[PDB]
Design a protein around this ligand. Structure first.
Ligand SMILES: CC(C)(COP(=O)(O)OP(=O)(O)OC[C@H]1O[C@@H](n2cnc3c(N)ncnc32)[C@H](O)[C@@H]1OP(=O)(O)O)[C@@H](O)C(=O)NCCC(=O)NCCS
Ligand SMILES: O=C1C[C@@H](c2ccc(O)cc2)Oc2cc(O)cc(O)c21
Ligand SMILES: O=C1C[C@@H](c2ccc(O)cc2)Oc2cc(O)cc(O)c21
Lengths: 391, 392
């Protein structure tokens, strides 16, 4: 039923896929969260909706967010009344922005990672581009290739309308790309901008208002490869296990639609409840596979900060000690919810802080760790990581 | 710099990624190409555009297409005048159709693939869903998973807004999922519906008119795995080499923009020209990596994305292929039109079946080796080197 087998025509690698560099970028406009409700109701000309703004100030005060970064600013929003409305035909001006600026922010994040990596751009064999912010043909993967001047034969994978869990997905994608191809070096870019999602307030769409309180802009970039070249490339985290779960009883929990008015956000179930009710089973299953067993307090944690109640309720249900989510909270406070890019920001802070505090390893002390993405399905992406030792 | 190595935690497979099953599906409405211009100019209130209709009749006549299948029909279009115009805000009505109908049609093709495969669907470990028709959150990958009742823990990969080259991308994607994961069985689904792209004619955007003559609807699905179970699973094609290339001097050749008027289609360079000048360089590099320092193009089987007949004609001319090589590619174009990322899988299925039918030596018309090519925006050329299986 088969011709006689031949050796793998495209050689594969032997070690684990390894993070060799991380770079991050954010748009230049900074928004204090504690005064953001004033700005938001000013720029949306909705100061007559008194009770709604009180509701929004509470949302912002309870977000665990201190500041956010956005491509949008006061000048740009005055120029587009249709994006300041809650529900006006927009998509076209929104697309005109994000199809340009999402590859641009990704390039700034990627240039940093390429620079830290140290190798020539020409060594990049694969490009994985992940966003939730607009679509186009050719995609932001093609645009990033041109902007960076990678070789025209890079193998690309364009991930559009992904959502918050895709920071975990890209790790699972790059794992197989890196491990199945000897010498493959994968450029992974997550890049998100709220220009598709910013909109005016409505008294009957309070979940849309939660989104206005939480979503920020940012781009993160990693170089993934297996078999790092000793004393030339420098490892930081190893990918050893990945898993995907549609959580029980979660149908319709989070929906997002791309419409003539832009991208709309819909909350319809207790998202922190469903995650925290089911996270025990998922991680226990992963740990049996990887180990078959360290404590949850003895591994490092990169958890997507969908919002603070997620991190809070996982922490309680699993009875974690409060430093386990500290790095994930650090990014949420410093940046807000940047959809897919969040976890890669958290990974970078983890390593930087572990180095700077002169700890044993890249993951704040521990040999093993977790990276968790959450979003729409309701989808939980699971990554078991190993760190590297340090001085 | 590293912790002590440990054995790979997730076992890998050893053989090549193999196609184990193919199924396809189309919407139920058939449109004869020869009289399609009469239907199209009438439904878009364009009967007065007398010379434009004569041009469109020529496009249809020279299209190499006999018929297409479409989810759209007469009743659906009359219910949506904003779609029968050239440039009205529609995207919402277009999304309402395709976010439901794309996973639906893919479900149809996937059930056929799974039935041929013969294994329990619970043994599917990965889902790759590929489309250029609509986007949604959660995606068509999620909806397909629910419709089929696959395991809740499948590893899903959602590929939106891909374009015509993506039939080769999913093969490339599926190669690494299957090979790096022992026991992985990947369901790959490409599902395309013209409801995103249909629009009335304009005398000044004849490239938009070109799309209206060529694009059809369809979905195709494959089961891809490595290390097949002897006597249980049946290999049909192996994936041995994958390559990707942005062709030189091709910026702007094919653009597609998702707007408030829906998906718009633009052609601003000689696309069959650019592909045919460069395909030799592309295929020569792939063959040198597979075979060293090498069969002739006439001695392999061809699965070429039929973006239009001029592409197949100009690759046939410049590479001096005998005319039989593109025949399978042209048969699918004839019977279905250009189904974006779904076509090549339709051509793959057609190839195997007529090889079995005519009792040829292999599943790729008696050749051992062959190509699957996808052409699209970028200009992106995706290259796959396949091996067939022998036949009794
Ligand atoms: C060329 C093709 C569009 C139609 O067949 P064709 O026989 O070449 O048409 P001919 O050139 O013989 O006929 C000429 C008329 O057709 C129309 N036409 C054909 N291709 C056209 C194009 N790219 N743009 C505009 N008009 C076109 C024109 O109106 C032309 O007359 P013009 O002088 O007014 O432009 C088709 O076979 C093809 O493959 N074209 C490009 C491939 C493609 O479309 N790829 C889709 C990719 S995802
Ligand atoms: O509606 C949006 C906005 C989007 C987004 C966030 C940050 C950013 O920078 C750009 C886009 O994030 C989301 C993530 C989801 O899981 C579901 C959603 O509906 C959305
Ligand atoms: O504009 C379209 C239509 C789309 C399409 C075709 C058939 C179908 O059934 C659904 C969508 O295919 C494309 C493929 C491209 O590379 C570029 C494009 O602009 C387009």
């Amino acid at each position: 039923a088969t011709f006689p087998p031949c050796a793998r025509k495209m050689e594969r690698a032997d070690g684990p896929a390894t993070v060799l560099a991380i770079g991050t970028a954010n748009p230049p406009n900074v928004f204090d969260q504690s005064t953001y409700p004033d700005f938001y109701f000013n720029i949306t000309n909705s100061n007559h909706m008194t009770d709604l703004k009180t509701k929004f100030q509470r949302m912002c005060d309870k977000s665990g967010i201190t500041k956010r970064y956005m491509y949008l600013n006061e000048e740009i929003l005055k120029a587009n009344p249709n994006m300041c409305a809650y529900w006006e035909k927009s998509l076209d001006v929104r697309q005109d922005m994000v199809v340009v600026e999402v590859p641009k922010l990704g390039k700034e994040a990627a240039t940093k990672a390429i620079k830290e990596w140290g190798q020539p751009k020409s060594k990049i064999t694969h490009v994985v581009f992940c966003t939730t912010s607009g679509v186009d043909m050719p995609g932001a993967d093609w645009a990033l290739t041109k902007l960076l001047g990678l070789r025209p034969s890079v193998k690309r994978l364009m991930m559009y309308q992904q959502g918050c869990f895709a920071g975990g997905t890209v790790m699972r994608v790059a794992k197989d790309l890196a491990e199945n191809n000897k010498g493959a070096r994968v450029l992974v870019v997550c890049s998100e901008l709220t220009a598709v999602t910013f909109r005016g307030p409505s008294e009957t769409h309070l979940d849309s208002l939660v989104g206005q309180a939480l979503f920020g802009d940012g781009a993160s970039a990693i170089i993934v490869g297996a078999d790092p070249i000793p004393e030339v490339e420098r490892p930081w985290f190893e990918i050893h296990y990945v898993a995907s779960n549609i959580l029980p009883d979660s149908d319709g929990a989070i929906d997002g639609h791309l419409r003539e008015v832009g991208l709309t956000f819909h909350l319809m179930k207790d998202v922190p409840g469903i995650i925290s009710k089911n996270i025990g089973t998922v991680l226990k299953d992963a740990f049996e596979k990887v180990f078959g067993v360290p404590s949850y307090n003895d591994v490092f944690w990169i958890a997507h900060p969908g919002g603070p109640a997620i991190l809070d309720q996982v922490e309680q249900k699993l009875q974690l000690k409060t430093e386990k989510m500290a790095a994930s909270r650090q990014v949420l406070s410093d940046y807000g919810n940047m959809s897919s890019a969040c976890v890669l920001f958290i990974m970078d802070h983890l390593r930087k802080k572990s180095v700077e505090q002169k700890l044993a390893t890249s993951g704040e002390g521990y040999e093993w760790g977790l990276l968790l993405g959450f979003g729409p399905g309701l989808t939980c992406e699971t990554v078991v990581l190993r760190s590297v030792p340090l001085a």
